[PDB]
Design a protein around this ligand. Structure first.
Ligand code: 8E8
Length: 263
């Protein structure tokens, strides 16, 4: 049931290449749009990932990119997903032509927060939430992607020269303490990225420097497009004590309240 027959796929366009490799746009059974992520040989702990895919296929939320199945009886293995025509959120935010309104940016945060509240409800950690992981569909809806996938990456630079230092709380950087509250911290950084139109967090600093900054209790500061009420929500994600950070349920309530006040 987790297995797609790759003979049912037609390849139409190259979408680009990440750490597992090439992603293509195509159709399933001649008609339905899909994305096809091809997992480069040596890149993944594939038997672990296949077992996890069974769980991932039962996750279902409107703001979570849907995993349709996998193709594992050849290599490279394929992950078949919902097609997100507007591509990765980070590049979408950096296109200045969009001329976003702040109501649109707030909606992007709300989309992600809904997805994360749903993952929170299923005790499923993202583990690498960031704008580079989120996707945007043809209607401008942002959805969370690549959820949990970092667990199966075999390149140790990621697991590190390529680790997501700029999206990690103090306890992760100091002790490798992952939790729901590390996803919360990352979500605040993602809200910062959205309101900053895709600026790299701590843009003047190296990763090493960033980790020192955070150790000394310093923080990102208010994007020009964020109101004080929006800044309060993102900043709440960065409490030094993990247990004092909000849940995604609380964050969602905070976001809806601001939407209502900023209407
Ligand atoms: C930033 C440029 C860009 O738009 N990118 C990066 C290059 C590929 C492109 N893209 N990737 C996917 C996609 C992501 C993740 C999965 O698999 C997955 C695994 C675990 C959990 C959820 C999903 C498959 C495909 C794209 C999709 N779906 N649509 C369009 N472009 C996609 C994004």
């Amino acid at each position: 049931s987790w297995e797609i027959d790759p003979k049912d796929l037609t390849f139409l366009k190259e979408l680009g290449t990440g750490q597992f490799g090439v992603v293509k746009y195509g159709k399933w059974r001649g008609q339905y749009d899909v994305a096809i992520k091809m997992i480069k040989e040596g890149s993944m702990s594939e038997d672990e990932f296949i077992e996890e895919a069974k769980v991932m296929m039962n996750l279902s939320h409107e703001k979570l990119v849907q995993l349709y199945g996998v193709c594992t009886k050849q290599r490279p293995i394929f992950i078949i997903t919902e097609y997100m025509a507007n591509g990765c959120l980070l590049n979408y935010l950096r296109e200045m032509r969009h001329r976003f309104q702040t109501q649109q940016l707030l909606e992007m945060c709300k989309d992600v927060c809904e997805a994360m509240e749903y993952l929170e409800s299923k005790q499923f950690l993202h583990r690498d939430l960031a704008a580079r992981n989120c996707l945007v569909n043809d209607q401008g809806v942002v959805k969370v992607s690549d959820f949990g996938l970092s667990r199966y990456v075999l390149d140790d630079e990621y697991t590190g020269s390529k680790f997501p230092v700029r999206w990690s709380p103090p306890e992760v950087l100091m002790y490798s303490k992952f939790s729901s509250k590390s996803d919360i911290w990352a979500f605040g950084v993602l809200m910062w990225e959205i309101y900053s139109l895709g600026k790299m967090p701590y843009e003047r600093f190296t990763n090493s420097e960033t980790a020192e900054h955070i150790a000394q209790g310093l923080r990102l500061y208010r994007p020009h497009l964020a109101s004080e009420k929006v800044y309060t929500i993102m900043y709440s994600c960065w409490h030094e004590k993990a247990d004092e950070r909000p849940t995604f349920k609380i964050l969602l309530s905070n976001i809806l309240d601001v939407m209502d006040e900023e209407s």
